[PDB]
């Protein structure tokens, strides 16, 4: 919606004479502005924009031009209150997440990851509004078992790993140290068969195929255990129903006997006197 | 550059009675329209723009806009010529991936996936311009062996998978399933101490903890294997050099023996 964390912007390389009113006038072309957080000495600050469209447009049209001999660095700031939810049931919806996780706080956006065909991946992306709400949801779903439907499968909640695929790696941020030169002596190319490089690359690729085999074995073990529990569903349900009914019957039989003996001793003590 | 695959636009909820001229009139504001493929039966079309900035202003301006009683739906099409490369060295970069895989075709974007701090995850993604070029690259790095850095770390190449992020699972298609409604009848809850769902959720939590433990064990084992293989660089290098020298020396020794005995016979 409007004024979310997706509209938060990270503006860098600000001049040392930066002021709140000047930046407020800078974003005057983009409607209202939210929290104006500024650090004078380090040259950057946090700003909030009106909407996501406005945020994207302002970020794109406000970076890379100089201001008093300082090119603006306005890039997308990371989400500080994200959460990923795993093991979701086979019938889920993003509004289901918006309603279920709304208990722990306001949900700016929750998305069940969908592949190309349309099948659910089984994971989710949850972005609350604030850090403390995210922490409380995380630890509550950790200690608790937050169901989502009739199918008694809880969902494990973990902090989302925010991976950045926009900047990648510009050359300038790289250290360019002695190792860099040590690792740039020879250009990229294939390996001539029967040499040192080819044999050692075969060692590496054998190791990587071992990686694939181990991950697939773990996947298979977990899938077989999941199928076993899916089959044990009905037996466990009926066993618990019968156990509850038996315990309740025992309790109520004891209550009946206790009431009967109470009345018996009361009438005996009344008739004796 | 201009007119990249990443500039393709998927437009949904298109009325059946539309024309290409009106289609270009809609996006005439952002500059000269490019590729235009329209399917009147399904009511969807594609268009390619000049760059990423104009593409994003278009997506953010024409989304959720009425059009003859139909809401305009503009989303991103899947990039088909995608190829996942990994095992990258921590000193690789966008231009290195561009140049190295340029030999197998034109590259539109090849970004090295980095975490929040910017450090390399060790992986990467490459978006080729044309699908067959991506297939040829995948093959040539599959049977062939491709290196990117002085340290011999081959890059394993596998096709990329497409996962929608800005769009979840629509509620209407979920409701198409007859039993989704009857499943939703029970509201989301915490379970209750003593009830059946509570103990059975405890069993699920035990299973998930065991799975996490197994994944951690594998990752630690592997990190160990990577460190061990890295520690044996110069041992293997020197062994190879010494073996080559020994083989050449043995060949020269055989030549010496043969020539010397022939000369002795002549003498």
From TrEMBL, chain A:
Superkingdom classification of source: Eukaryota
Record carries keyword Signal: no
Protein name: Non-POU domain-containing octamer-binding protein
UniProt lineage: Eukaryota, Metazoa, Chordata, Craniata, Vertebrata
Location in the cell: Chromosome; Nucleus speckle; Nucleus, Nucleolus
Complete-protein stretch covered: 69 to 341 of 472
Keyword annotations of the record: Acetylation, Activator, Biological rhythms, Chromosome, Coiled coil, DNA damage, DNA recombination, DNA repair, DNA-binding, Immunity, Innate immunity, Isopeptide bond, Methylation, mRNA processing, mRNA splicing, Nucleus, Phosphoprotein, Repeat, Repressor, RNA-binding, Transcription, Transcription regulation, Ubl conjugation
Ranges for domain RRM: 7-79, 81-162
GO cellular component terms listed in the entry, alphabetical order: chromosome; fibrillar center; nuclear matrix; nuclear speck; paraspeckles; RNA polymerase II transcription regulator complex
Subunit structure and binding partners: Monomer and component of the SFPQ-NONO complex, which is probably a heterotetramer of two 52 kDa (NONO) and two 100 kDa (SFPQ) subunits. NONO is a component of spliceosome and U5.4/6 snRNP complexes. Interacts with CPNE4 (via VWFA domain). Forms heterodimers with PSPC1; this involves formation of a coiled coil domain by helices from both proteins. Part of complex consisting of SFPQ, NONO and MATR3. Part of a complex consisting of SFPQ, NONO and NR5A1. Part of a complex consisting of SFPQ, NONO and TOP1. Interacts with SPI1 and SPIB. Interacts with RNF43. Interacts with PER1 and PER2.
Any GO molecular function: chromatin binding
GO biological processes: activation of innate immune response; DNA recombination; DNA repair; innate immune response; mRNA processing; negative regulation of DNA-templated transcription; negative regulation of oxidative stress-induced neuron intrinsic apoptotic signaling pathway; regulation of circadian rhythm
Regions annotated as coiled coil: 208-273
Automatic annotation (TrEMBL), chain B:
Localisation per UniProt entry: Nucleus matrix; Nucleus speckle
Ranges for domain RRM: 7-79, 81-162
Protein name in UniProt: Splicing factor proline/glutamine rich (polypyrimidine tract binding protein associated)
Native source organism of the sequence: Cricetulus griseus
Lineage of origin: Eukaryota, Metazoa, Chordata, Craniata, Vertebrata
Parent-protein residues present: 287 to 553 of 703
């Amino acid at each position: 919606k409007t004024f979310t964390q997706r509209s938060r912007l990270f503006v860098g390389n600000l001049p040392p004479d930066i002021t709140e009113e000047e930046m407020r006038k800078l974003f005057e072309k983009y409607g209202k502005a939210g929290e104006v957080f500024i650090h004078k000495d380090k040259g950057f600050g946090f700003i909030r924009l009106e909407t996501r469209t406005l945020a994207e447009i302002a970020k794109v049209e406000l970076d890379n031009m100089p201001l008093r001999g300082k090119q603006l660095r306005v890039r997308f700031a990371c989400h500080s209150a994200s959460l990923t939810v795993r093991n979701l049931p086979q019938y889920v919806s993003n509004e289901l997440l918006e309603e279920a996780f709304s208990v722990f706080g306001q949900v700016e956006r929750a998305v069940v990851i969908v592949d190309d065909r349309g099948r659910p991946s089984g994971k989710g992306i949850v972005e609350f509004s604030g850090k403390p709400a995210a922490r409380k949801a995380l630890d509550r779903c950790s200690e608790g078992s937050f169901l989502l439907t009739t199918f008694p499968r809880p969902v494990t909640v973990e902090p989302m790993d925010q991976l950045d695929d926009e900047e990648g790696l510009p050359e300038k941020l790289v250290i360019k140290n002695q190792q860099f030169h040590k690792e740039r002596e020879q250009p990229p190319r294939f390996a001539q068969p029967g040499s040192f490089e080819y044999e050692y690359a075969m060692r590496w690729k054998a190791l990587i195929e071992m990686e694939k085999q181990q991950q697939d074995q773990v996947d298979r073990n977990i899938k077989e255990a999941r199928e076993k529990l899916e089959m044990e569903m009905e037996a466990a349900r009926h066993e618990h129903q019968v156990m509850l009914m038996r315990q309740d019957l025992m309790r109520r039989q004891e209550e009946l006997r206790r009431m009967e003996e109470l009345h018996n001793q009361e009438v005996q003590k009344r008739k004796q006197l | 550059k201009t007119y990249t695959q990443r500039c393709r636009l998927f437009v949904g909820n298109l009325p059946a009675d539309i024309t290409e001229d009106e289609f270009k009139r809609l996006f005439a504001k952002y500059g000269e329209p490019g590729e235009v493929f329209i399917n009147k039966g399904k009511g969807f079309g594609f268009i390619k723009l000049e760059s990423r900035a104009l593409a994003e202003i278009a997506k953010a301006e024409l989304d959720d806009t009425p059009m003859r009683g139909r809401q305009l739906r503009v989303r991103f099409a899947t990039h088909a010529a995608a190829l996942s490369v990994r095992n990258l060295s921590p000193y690789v970069s966008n231009e290195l991936l561009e140049e190295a895989f340029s030999q197998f075709g034109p590259i539109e974007r090849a970004v090295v996936i980095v975490d929040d701090r910017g450090r390399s995850t060790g992986k990467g993604i490459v978006e080729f311009a044309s699908k067959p070029a991506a297939r040829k690259a995948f093959e040539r790095c599959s049977e062939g062996v491709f290196l990117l850095t002085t340290t011999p770390r081959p890059v394993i190449v596998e096709p990329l998978e497409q996962l929608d992020d800005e769009d979840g699972l629509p509620e209407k298609l979920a409701q198409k399933n007859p039993m989704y409604q009857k499943e939703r009848e029970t509201p989301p809850r915490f379970a209750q101490h003593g009830t059946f769902e509570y103990e059975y959720s405890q069993r699920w939590k035990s299973l998930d903890e065991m799975e996490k433990q197994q994944r951690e064990q594998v990752e630690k084992n592997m990190k160990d294997a990577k460190d061990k293989l890295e520690s044996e660089m110069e041992d293997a290098y020197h062994e190879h050099q010494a073996n080559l020298l020994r083989q050449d020396l043995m060949r020269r020794q055989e030549e010496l023996r043969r020539m010397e005995e022939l000369h002795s016979q002549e003498m």
